[PDB]
Design a binder for this molecule. Structure first.
Ligand SMILES: [Mg+2]
Lengths: 521, 49, 106, 171
């Protein structure tokens, strides 16, 4: 259908839509900082030496107490108040402009100057009732999830991005003075509303895309919606980021306050809910792996779903390391008595099987390094669990029991690390039978494969996975030297931390014959 | 080190030392990492088969 | 002389919304889109864009108010500066008005 | 206490009927008779019951079975929603549902009996909680009420109390 011949009003409407699409790629911006700056600087105009009180509040503080009064009004349902979200985004951008701004790009002096810029931006906002107003906004909503609570969580992340221990002190002081219930109930209710990946929903995700066309090409409503296997991907990450930022710096009060509350009449454990969410995520990943076990190839949508799933898992693990950071004997005993072992056995199982199955495809190496990075954060968390460990102990005994229960995956990963490390030495060996020195090297990869298969000593099988990793068009380069032995910086980094873990578990919990086999392997 | 290379190829290497099977022990120890033929040739041992 | 497949599929096989979009798309971009169309159309489009932008609160740089938006903004700032206001409806009204004059194109 | 695979476990039912607590166990002869009957051991002190006909063994437990598609080409704790495999102790046969059955409520009436080789879909049964105290993904303990559903019959494994002495059927 040609553009000519069409009535005019439909063309004008399409022009309005296209010009709206082209309208705002980037906005004026800074306008938020300009507004905050103009309201902040002249609090007080011509005083004429008239001070009825100690200090009359500037209009920024007036708006802060207006929002606090609006949140403190007792109701049954929370209204929209889109202007509140607009001001929240304005102040969040004003506070986080320096955070978004942040070889060697900057020097020490400029880095310190930008740190002072961020500190001044945070002090412009938090020397008011901002923390009280965001706590009141969180406590206002019981379990309802929306854009307003997401904006509030983003603002809370923006305030304590660099830790902001003074804001933490004010937070604890107000929580202990008010001693009210509802904040932890709202946090738990928002935690239960989080969803995971679904297999029946994934088969429904198989169906619709297969329709040849909907409306014009893909249906416009479906194409923009893209629908999802994770209804709210950002909200869970923002919630765990805010919880991490509350405990970012070593402040024991919060590591114990989250476990139990003395002033409040009801105790809600965030750590147990986090363990249950991690169990649900582990079950979802195991189900997705079992469904994808039959197929030998993974689509790009599956790659994206895995990337977001392990991003969420990495965020949860970073929150866990932040809690177990500190000496914190109570949370260490709680994780000793929790159901974390059933989660981590399945995690080790899916790590071993996904690394074994995922290694053959060369184009999926990015997902493999993401999985390896997640394993890193896991072994960092495991190392952080061993802080303050007795020689005999009971945490070390539970770790030994975990290794015994997950023996097969541990032996598999140790055997793999043995085989790829052993291969780097054999290639440096005479290897007279390959007989080639070349930029390609190119032991004809197909020709090399009969030659590679012959090893006088050690392993015949390992070379074949390597051949697949090498790019081989016309067998132009086995290039065993080029793309130097695959992912060395990535896998070598996940080897030192499983080594020091074995050294820690070997020096402690002595006289255990079951760990001797693991040490020998 | 340079002067000891002449006695390695001689068949009469063990004369005063009690162990007469040092060449076989070295061949069995380094037969897998290094080539059996090269280590055998370097220590004399003609017609190893 | 050639197939001219791309021109044909862009002109007659494309949906008309996609036709007008790709007709206009990336004309704001300086170097991209291979510079389609005559230059008077592009110049008029950029002229209207900079026109409306100057009509809004965009500075386009490259004390007296003298217009409505700065007058209203300074009125709100001075009204908040002089005294601690107590009626919440007035506070909501002035904050909404200040947001409207500050936002502009939004 | 949680139950694990490779361990011999029997299945029973405790039903108040005829104003009396009747404990019933599923017992299958194996050789000679493939169908299963029910044995009441309420008067265990008075009349001794038969034990070898009743016992069963747990072979495996898999939540998601891709094994069947591949075929078409240690001790692990049981959990809710996991399919299990039952093997007879005496006849070394596997319990399953059968297509042809005696017809009372004829549409919803499939019998249960042994088969020699576990190369079919009817062998596996999935466990679900009876009460809200235990949810899915929770470990199964001794003395907890469970409901077993065959993956092929899609039936609740019902006891028949409709004017009969005692019948067991996929209903
Ligand atoms: Mg830390």
């Amino acid at each position: 259908t040609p553009l000519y011949n069409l009535p005019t009003h439909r063309a004008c409407n399409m022009f309005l839509e296209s010009y709206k699409a082209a309208w705002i790629l980037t906005e004026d911006h800074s306008f938020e900082d300009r507004m905050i700056d103009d309201l902040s600087k002249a609090g007080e105009q011509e005083e004429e030496e008239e001070e009825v009180e100690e200090k009359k509040p500037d209009p920024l503080h007036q708006l802060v107490l207006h929002f606090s009064r609006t949140a403190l009004t007792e109701k049954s349902k929370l209204d929209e108040d889109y202007l509140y979200m607009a001001y929240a985004d304005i102040m969040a951008k004003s506070c986080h402009l320096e955070e978004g701004g942040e070889e060697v790009e900057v020097s020490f002096e400029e880095k310190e100057m930008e740190k002072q810029r961020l500190l001044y931006q945070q002090s412009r906002l938090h020397t008011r009732g901002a923390a009280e107003m965001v706590l009141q906004m969180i406590s206002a909503c019981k379990g309802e999830t929306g854009a307003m609570v997401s904006s509030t969580l983003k603002l809370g992340i923006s305030i304590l991005n660099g830790g902001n221990a003074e804001v933490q002190q004010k937070m604890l002081d107000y929580l202990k003075d008010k001693k009210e219930v509802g904040f932890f109930q709202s946090i738990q209710a928002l935690m239960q509303t989080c969803s995971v990946l679904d297999l029946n929903a994934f088969e429904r995700q198989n169906k619709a895309e297969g329709l040849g066309m909907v409306n014009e090409d893909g249906t416009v409503i479906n194409r923009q919606n893209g629908e999802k296997v994770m209804a709210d991907d950002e909200f869970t990450q923002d919630l765990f980021r805010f919880l991490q930022l509350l405990c970012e710096g070593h402040n024991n009060d919060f590591q114990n306050y989250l476990r139990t509350q003395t002033g409040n009449t009801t105790t809600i454990n965030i750590i147990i809910c986090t363990v249950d969410y991690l169990l649900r995520l582990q079950e979802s990943i195991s189900d997705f792996y079992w469904y994808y076990s039959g197929k030998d190839v993974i689509e790009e949508q599956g790659k994206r779903n895995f990337s977001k799933a392990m991003s969420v898992a990495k965020q949860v693990f970073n929150s866990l390391t932040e809690y177990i950071q500190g000496p914190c004997t109570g949370n260490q005993q709680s994780l000793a008595h929790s159901r974390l072992w059933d989660a981590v056995v399945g995690f080790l199982h899916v790590f071993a099987h996904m690394m074994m199955k995922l290694a053959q495809d060369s184009s999926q190496i990015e997902l493999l390094k993401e999985l390896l990075d997640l394993q890193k954060d896991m072994v960092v968390m495991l190392l952080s669990l061993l802080e303050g460990n007795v020689v005999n102990g009971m945490i070390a005994r539970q770790m030994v029991d975990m290794l015994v229960e997950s023996s097969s995956n541990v032996e598999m990963i140790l055997k793999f690390f043995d085989m790829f490390l052993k291969l780097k030495d054999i290639v440096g060996s005479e290897a007279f039978q390959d007989y080639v020195t070349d930029p390609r090297g190119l032991i004809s990869k197909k020709d090399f494969q009969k030659a590679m298969d012959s090893q006088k000593q050690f392993t015949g099988p390992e070379i074949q996975f390597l051949l697949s990793c090498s790019e081989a068009d016309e067998n132009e380069m086995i290039n065993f030297e080029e793309f130097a032995n695959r992912f060395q910086e990535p896998a070598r980094d996940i080897g030192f931390n499983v080594a020091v873990l074995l050294t820690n578990l070997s020096e402690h919990v002595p006289h255990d014959p079951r760990l001797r086999n693991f040490l020998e392997l | 080190g340079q002067w000891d290379r002449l006695v390695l190829n001689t068949p009469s290497f063990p004369s005063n030392y009690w162990d007469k099977f040092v060449k076989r022990k070295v061949l069995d120890k380094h037969g897998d990492i290094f080539g059996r033929e090269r280590i055998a040739e370097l220590l004399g041992m003609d017609l190893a088969s | 002389s050639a197939a001219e497949t791309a021109r044909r599929t862009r002109e007659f096989r494309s949906p008309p919304q996609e036709q007008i979009n790709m007709l206009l798309h990336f004309k704001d971009e300086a170097d991209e889109e291979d510079c389609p169309l005559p230059e008077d159309i592009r110049q008029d489009l950029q002229d209207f864009h900079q026109d409306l932008l100057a009509h809004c609160g965009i500075q386009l740089e490259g004390k007296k108010p003298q217009s409505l938006q700065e007058l209203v903004s300074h009125m709100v700032v001075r009204w908040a500066q002089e005294d601690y206001v107590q009626s919440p409806e007035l506070v909501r009204a002035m904050f909404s008005l200040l947001h409207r004059q500050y936002d502009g194109l939004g | 206490q949680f139950l694990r695979t490779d361990d011999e476990v029997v299945l029973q039912c405790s039903a108040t009927v005829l104003k009396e607590q009747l404990k019933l166990c599923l017992a299958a002869e194996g050789f000679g008779n493939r169908l299963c009957f029910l044995e009441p051991t309420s008067n265990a002190q008075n009349v001794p019951p038969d034990l070898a006909i009743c016992c069963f063994t747990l072979e495996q437990s898999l939540s998601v079975r891709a094994l069947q598609e591949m075929l078409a080409n240690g001790h692990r704790t049981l959990l809710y929603g996991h399919a299990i495999l039952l093997r007879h102790a005496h006849s070394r046969m596997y319990l399953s549902c059968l297509t042809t059955s005696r017809s009372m409520t004829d549409k919803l009436a499939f019998d249960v009996g042994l088969q020699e080789d576990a190369t079919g879909e009817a062998c596996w049964w999935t466990m679900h909680p009876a009460s809200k105290q235990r949810s899915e993904g929770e470990k199964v303990r001794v003395g907890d009420d469970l409901i077993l559903v065959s993956v092929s019959s899609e039936r609740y494994l019902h006891l028949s109390t409709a004017s009969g002495e005692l019948q067991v059927d996929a209903s």
